[PDB]
Structure formats: structure tokens, C-alpha cells
Design a protein around this nucleic acid. Structure first.
Ligand code: MG
Ligand code: MG
Ligand code: MG
Ligand code: MG
Ligand code: MG
Ligand code: MG
Ligand code: MG
Ligand code: MG
Ligand code: MG
Ligand code: MG
Ligand code: MG
Ligand code: MG
Ligand code: MG
Ligand code: MG
Ligand code: MG
Ligand code: MG
Ligand code: MG
Ligand code: MG
Ligand code: MG
Ligand code: MG
Ligand code: MG
Ligand code: MG
Ligand code: MG
Ligand code: MG
Ligand code: MG
Ligand code: MG
Ligand code: MG
Ligand code: MG
Ligand code: MG
Ligand code: MG
Ligand code: MG
Ligand code: MG
Ligand code: MG
Ligand code: MG
Ligand code: MG
Ligand code: MG
Ligand code: MG
Ligand code: MG
Ligand code: MG
Ligand code: MG
Ligand code: MG
Ligand code: MG
Ligand code: MG
Ligand code: MG
Ligand code: MG
Ligand code: MG
Ligand code: MG
Ligand code: MG
Ligand code: MG
Ligand code: MG
Ligand code: MG
Ligand code: MG
Ligand code: MG
Ligand code: MG
Ligand code: MG
Ligand code: MG
Ligand code: MG
Ligand code: MG
Ligand code: MG
Ligand code: MG
Ligand code: MG
Ligand code: MG
Ligand code: MG
Ligand code: MG
Ligand code: MG
Ligand code: MG
Ligand code: MG
Ligand code: MG
Ligand code: MG
Ligand code: MG
Ligand code: MG
Ligand code: MG
Ligand code: MG
Ligand code: MG
Ligand code: MG
Ligand code: MG
Ligand code: MG
Ligand code: MG
Ligand code: MG
Lengths: 116, 155, 70
RNA sequence: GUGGGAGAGGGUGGUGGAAUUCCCGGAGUAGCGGUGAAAUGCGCAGAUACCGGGAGGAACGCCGAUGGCGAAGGCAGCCACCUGGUCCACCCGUGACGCUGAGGCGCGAAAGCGUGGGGAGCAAACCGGAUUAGAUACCCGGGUAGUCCACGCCCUAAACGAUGCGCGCUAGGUCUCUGGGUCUCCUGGGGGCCGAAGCUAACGCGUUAAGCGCGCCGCCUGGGGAGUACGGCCGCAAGGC
């Protein structure tokens, strides 16, 4: 009900899940999907297959609002990070550009024991 | 086969059809090393398929074997504790042994009394897309594309 | 590949305000390139690091950037 | 003395961007999170993911080094002021003014103590969830002291090169930081690696000695009992010598 037709797709890939948000060119989201939004429940969310179906579900959801062009933004290291992009290219949405914007601190906050 | 590649056995061409796939199918019918009995089964089963159907038993045999070939299957692989059913393609050689073994196994699950009756009826049903053997094939390709979530463990 | 000192003129390593040459020392991201890629000496690199950080506070050099690939 | 040098050496004030958390707004649904699997947890009072604004605390990515500085502990954003050590060139000045150093005095990571602040992230204890034969644990979700600041204590350490300080002497080769030079190189002062002679039980050390000598301080004399008991000094206590 908006007819945006061009916008951004953020891929948030972590080792436990991949989730995709699709926004208008000034950043406000339109639709979204994830490994949990499609059927998967447990550790299967952080699989590349889930990443595929997640990207594709958010892709078809953005078709409804009439999207064609997409600027891909990627954050995180995770399985199916590449597998989710490859899904977005094939989804029919023309992929304008791809940028990796993973936030790395300049060593400011003490990490949980897991990450030291 | 730890050292070598374990070359494939080259079977004798058929006495009747001159086809090696026939002999290989005859051998799966054989039990206790009675190849004479197992041939008379298959060939008498070719009379059945060619009378009850006005077609060439050779082409139906192949067309049946083709419909039972599985394009994918699942195997197990030990990963982080308990293992997983991993989908992966089927070698063209393994599609041979599996389709042939399944056809013989399916036909002997059949109601029909005599052996050659069961072979012919199975081959016919298999070539038409039904019958017990095509079930084992359609059920295997269902394991893959269900565990499709583990296509990254290809190995 | 070439090194940055190899393809450049005679420049002031201490002038924090000259962006055209200082920009040639950052990477695709705002990162300060290693000596392997700047061709600088041990002492020259120490001076570059400090001048680049000065230019970053004046708003002339970027602290970090976004990679357009992958 | 003069003229030059390099440096996360110290103290004080100021300041910059990235990131985490929290709050405000926008947009936006059904989950997020987490693991070997999970579950507790959080989410329809709208989370996660996304854009914008703000607050606050802590630590400085790249540069970054096998690098540098310091007596040791230890020292990394940037700026300014106050300040210590140190090296080189000149051969100018004093004229043995030196070395070490029981006692004393000061410094002394982390943890811990007191008083008053601060409190984002992390996190003993603790509260849960899992695992398990059990789980007083490893893994997961929370979380207080604490970690940070000021002022005052505490004085331990694998405080390690497990190698006290200074001086002289005894093949070289090679990598390096920083000076000076008539700048393939020479010559100092550091930091490394091979290795002459020699030493060493062996490993190994070898112009940065574990070689050859000299001066001075500390210290050892089988293991357990035991860094315990007693006494003394110190400490608010923990405790230390
Ligand atoms: Mg998961
Ligand atoms: Mg960090
Ligand atoms: Mg910390
Ligand atoms: Mg940190
Ligand atoms: Mg780690
Ligand atoms: Mg993380
Ligand atoms: Mg990391
Ligand atoms: Mg890592
Ligand atoms: Mg670490
Ligand atoms: Mg790490
Ligand atoms: Mg086992
Ligand atoms: Mg197993
Ligand atoms: Mg199993
Ligand atoms: Mg399994
Ligand atoms: Mg003079
Ligand atoms: Mg300093
Ligand atoms: Mg300072
Ligand atoms: Mg300071
Ligand atoms: Mg909100
Ligand atoms: Mg639920
Ligand atoms: Mg939570
Ligand atoms: Mg909570
Ligand atoms: Mg609820
Ligand atoms: Mg609930
Ligand atoms: Mg924000
Ligand atoms: Mg606050
Ligand atoms: Mg980092
Ligand atoms: Mg880092
Ligand atoms: Mg580094
Ligand atoms: Mg570093
Ligand atoms: Mg060092
Ligand atoms: Mg030093
Ligand atoms: Mg140390
Ligand atoms: Mg000074
Ligand atoms: Mg004189
Ligand atoms: Mg005189
Ligand atoms: Mg005299
Ligand atoms: Mg003394
Ligand atoms: Mg005194
Ligand atoms: Mg102390
Ligand atoms: Mg402390
Ligand atoms: Mg305190
Ligand atoms: Mg925590
Ligand atoms: Mg915890
Ligand atoms: Mg057990
Ligand atoms: Mg600390
Ligand atoms: Mg130490
Ligand atoms: Mg000893
Ligand atoms: Mg000792
Ligand atoms: Mg000496
Ligand atoms: Mg020179
Ligand atoms: Mg030297
Ligand atoms: Mg060598
Ligand atoms: Mg060697
Ligand atoms: Mg050699
Ligand atoms: Mg020798
Ligand atoms: Mg020896
Ligand atoms: Mg030896
Ligand atoms: Mg050696
Ligand atoms: Mg000498
Ligand atoms: Mg000596
Ligand atoms: Mg003693
Ligand atoms: Mg004794
Ligand atoms: Mg004993
Ligand atoms: Mg003992
Ligand atoms: Mg004992
Ligand atoms: Mg004992
Ligand atoms: Mg003892
Ligand atoms: Mg003992
Ligand atoms: Mg004891
Ligand atoms: Mg004794
Ligand atoms: Mg003790
Ligand atoms: Mg006594
Ligand atoms: Mg006592
Ligand atoms: Mg007392
Ligand atoms: Mg007590
Ligand atoms: Mg106690
Ligand atoms: Mg004690
Ligand atoms: Mg005691």
C-alpha cells in the first residue's frame, strides 16, 4: 500500500540466525523475515538454507509493495551470509550495490567471557 | 577399498538381448547361485509383459529401470555429537544398483503367486510410474529436500 | 603492486592539512595502511600515523568507511 | 658545558570518533536470543532487525612491530602545559669528585580495606536454566560486591631473563630501533637470531656471558612437619615481614 519500488535490504547474519529487513531509501523498513519467520525453530535458523528462505520471504514480501531495485547492506559474520545474498540476487529484485557495514568497535566495551 | 579405486565388474552381454543391464538384473534375481532358474524367471516374465502389453519388453525394462533411479539420497555424518542425515547426489553407478535391487525386492513383496508374474507386473507398474519400487525411490528423494537444511555438509 | 611512497612527489609528512596526499595513505576503509603498502620507514610511519589522526579530528580524513563489495 | 636527537617515561587539564547499554521519535510484524541439542530469559504494555535524536560510562580499532620508554611494577586516540630518564657530536670545563651498599626513606600489577562519588559493559558471591550417576563445575539466562574517579591504607606475585650491581678483557655473521659520519659502508647507544674460544650434569650460555677476572650486597646447606607455632614489628581488617 506504499509503492516504494526502490530501497535497502539489510542482512543481519549471526552464527545462530540470519534475518533480513527491507526498507525504503531513507531507512524506514517495509517488510522483514528470518530463519524463525519461516518454519525453522532451533539451531536450523543459523543454517544457510534458512538464510536463503528468509531472504526470499522478505523479497516476495517487498514485491507486494512493488519493489524492484535493492541496495544490499550486510552486517555480521555468519553461515548463510553469502547464501542469503545469493538468494537476493536470484529473487528478481535487481541488486543495485552490496556493502558490508559490520560494526566493529575501536576497542571500547569489555566482551563477555565467551568472546575473549 | 583403501588403496585402489576398486574397478567395476564388467558383466557378460545378454544371451537374448545382448544387453548388459539385463544380465545385471538377472543376477539380482538369482539366489543360491541358480542362474539358470533366475534367467527362466526373467525371460518368462518377458513373455508376460509382451503379451499382456503389445510393447517390446526390452524398452519397458529400461523405461521401468529409469523411473526407479533416484537422483538424490541421504547419508549420515558424525558432527558435534549425534550425526545428521545429509542429502547429496547419487553416483550414476549407484543409481544402477539401487534401481535394480529395488525392482527385485518390490516384486517379491507382490501378491502374485508365481515369480515371473511378479517381475513382469512390477516392471509394468514401475514403467507407468507406480508400483512398489517407485515408492522406495520417491520416498528417498523425499529424505533429501527435507533435510535440505544440511546441504552444507556435502562431503 | 606499487607502494604509496614510490608513486608520489616530495611531500610534507608532518602537514596534517594536505588531504590529497593523506587520502592516498588510507585504505578502502579509513584504515592506515601498513608499512608493507606505504613503503615508509620505521620513523616515517610513526609520523604519518600521528598526522593522519590529527586530520581525522579536523574532519578531513575519515575514521572508518564502508566496503562496497562481497 | 655546548649543540642536536628519539620515545605508549611520569603528572594535569582539555578533547575526538567507533562501539555497547538506556531513553525519545519514526517505520515495521512474531518472534528474538541461545546451545552439541536445548531450556530458563525477553517479546502483543509491539521486542528482534532498520533510520533519526539524546544521555552516560568505560576502553582506545587501523597505525602496531619479532617495535619503543621506564629502576622495577608498568606505559597505546588527539591536543596543550608542567616534568624525569637517556643517547649522539664537539674534546670546552672540574680534577678520582668513584663502585657497591647492612639499616633507613620512597616506589611497588591484580585482588582486597576505609570515606565520598560514579556505575555503560563485564562480573566472585548469589538466583535460575541445562548437563550429569551426582554438578556445590565446565555451557546458557540474570546478577551484587568489584572493575572506573578522588583521598588514605594494604606491600603480596610465575613482582620471570626463574639470571643482583658496576668495571675491565675474550672470533665473527645476520636482522633491527635510534643517533653521527668522508652515507657499497664506517662508527656509537639499544633490541633479536646464529655461532669462535671457553663454560655447563645436560638443555643450553656465548661482546645483551651462564666465558675470563676484580669489588661490594643479598641468599642456600636433604624431604615432610611449615612459610606452620611462639615472640616481635607493622596493619582498621584481610593479613604481611
Ligand atoms: Mg538458533
Ligand atoms: Mg575489543
Ligand atoms: Mg576491561
Ligand atoms: Mg576492551
Ligand atoms: Mg574468541
Ligand atoms: Mg557478538
Ligand atoms: Mg573478535
Ligand atoms: Mg573470532
Ligand atoms: Mg581476547
Ligand atoms: Mg577474539
Ligand atoms: Mg560418542
Ligand atoms: Mg554419533
Ligand atoms: Mg544417528
Ligand atoms: Mg540424524
Ligand atoms: Mg663550547
Ligand atoms: Mg606519555
Ligand atoms: Mg600521560
Ligand atoms: Mg593523559
Ligand atoms: Mg521505540
Ligand atoms: Mg514462546
Ligand atoms: Mg534476553
Ligand atoms: Mg533481562
Ligand atoms: Mg508477553
Ligand atoms: Mg513470556
Ligand atoms: Mg540509534
Ligand atoms: Mg546513565
Ligand atoms: Mg575491534
Ligand atoms: Mg583488534
Ligand atoms: Mg597489534
Ligand atoms: Mg593493538
Ligand atoms: Mg614489547
Ligand atoms: Mg629499555
Ligand atoms: Mg611484564
Ligand atoms: Mg625531556
Ligand atoms: Mg680537556
Ligand atoms: Mg688543570
Ligand atoms: Mg690528589
Ligand atoms: Mg635498602
Ligand atoms: Mg632519608
Ligand atoms: Mg600495590
Ligand atoms: Mg587495585
Ligand atoms: Mg573501594
Ligand atoms: Mg552479562
Ligand atoms: Mg554467568
Ligand atoms: Mg558422568
Ligand atoms: Mg582491571
Ligand atoms: Mg611481570
Ligand atoms: Mg630454584
Ligand atoms: Mg623469588
Ligand atoms: Mg661492561
Ligand atoms: Mg645516516
Ligand atoms: Mg649492539
Ligand atoms: Mg643464521
Ligand atoms: Mg640453525
Ligand atoms: Mg645454519
Ligand atoms: Mg665449543
Ligand atoms: Mg656439551
Ligand atoms: Mg649441543
Ligand atoms: Mg645462542
Ligand atoms: Mg671489547
Ligand atoms: Mg660481564
Ligand atoms: Mg629468607
Ligand atoms: Mg629436616
Ligand atoms: Mg613429598
Ligand atoms: Mg614440597
Ligand atoms: Mg608433598
Ligand atoms: Mg601436604
Ligand atoms: Mg615448606
Ligand atoms: Mg609445602
Ligand atoms: Mg600442609
Ligand atoms: Mg627445615
Ligand atoms: Mg603466605
Ligand atoms: Mg619464641
Ligand atoms: Mg604473629
Ligand atoms: Mg594492632
Ligand atoms: Mg574475615
Ligand atoms: Mg578467610
Ligand atoms: Mg596469605
Ligand atoms: Mg596466615
Amino acid at each position: 500500500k506504499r509503492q516504494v519500488a526502490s530501497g535497502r535490504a539489510y542482512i543481519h547474519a549471526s552464527y545462530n540466525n540470519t534475518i533480513v529487513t527491507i526498507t525504503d531509501p531513507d531507512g524506514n523498513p517495509i517488510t522483514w523475515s528470518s530463519g524463525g519467520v519461516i518454519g525453522y525453530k532451533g539451531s536450523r535458523k543459523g543454517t544457510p538454507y534458512a538464510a536463503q528462505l528468509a531472504a526470499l520471504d522478505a523479497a516476495k514480501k517487498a514485491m507486494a509493495y512493488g519493489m524492484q531495485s535493492v541496495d544490499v547492506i550486510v552486517r555480521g559474520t555468519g553461515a548463510g551470509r553469502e547464501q542469503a545474498i545469493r538468494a537476493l540476487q536470484a529473487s528478481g529484485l535487481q541488486v543495485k550495490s552490496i556493502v558490508d557495514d559490520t560494526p566493529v568497535p575501536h576497542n571500547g566495551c569489555r566482551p563477555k567471557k565467551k568472546f575473549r | 577399498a583403501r588403496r585402489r579405486r576398486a574397478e567395476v565388474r564388467q558383466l557378460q552381454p545378454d544371451l537374448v538381448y545382448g544387453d548388459v543391464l539385463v544380465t545385471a538384473f538377472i543376477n539380482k534375481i538369482m539366489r543360491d547361485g541358480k542362474k539358470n532358474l533366475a534367467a527362466r524367471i526373467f525371460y518368462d516374465a518377458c513373455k508376460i509383459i509382451q503379451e499382456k502389453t503389445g510393447q517390446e519388453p526390452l524398452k519397458v525394462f529400461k523405461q521401468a529401470v529409469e523411473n526407479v533411479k533416484p537422483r538424490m539420497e541421504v547419508r549420515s555424518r558424525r558432527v558435534g555429537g549425534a550425526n545428521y542425515q545429509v542429502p547429496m547426489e547419487v553416483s550414476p553407478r549407484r543409481q544402477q544398483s539401487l534401481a535394480l535391487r529395488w525392482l527385485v525386492q518390490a516384486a517379491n513383496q507382490r501378491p502374485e503367486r508365481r515369480a515371473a508374474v511378479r517381475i513382469a507386473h512390477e516392471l509394468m507398474d514401475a514403467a507407468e510410474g507406480k508400483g512398489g519400487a517407485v515408492k522406495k525411490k520417491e520416498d528417498v528423494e523425499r529424505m533429501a529436500e527435507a533435510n535440505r537444511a544440511y546441504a552444507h555438509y556435502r562431503w | 603492486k606499487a607502494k604509496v611512497k614510490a608513486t608520489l612527489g616530495e611531500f610534507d609528512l608532518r602537514d596534517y592539512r594536505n588531504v590529497e596526499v593523506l587520502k592516498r595513505f588510507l585504505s578502502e576503509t579509513g584504515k592506515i595502511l601498513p608499512r608493507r603498502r606505504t613503503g615508509l620507514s620505521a620513523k616515517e610511519q610513526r609520523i604519518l600515523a600521528k598526522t593522519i589522526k590529527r586530520a581525522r579530528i579536523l574532519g578531513l580524513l575519515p575514521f572508518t568507511e564502508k566496503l562496497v563489495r562481497k
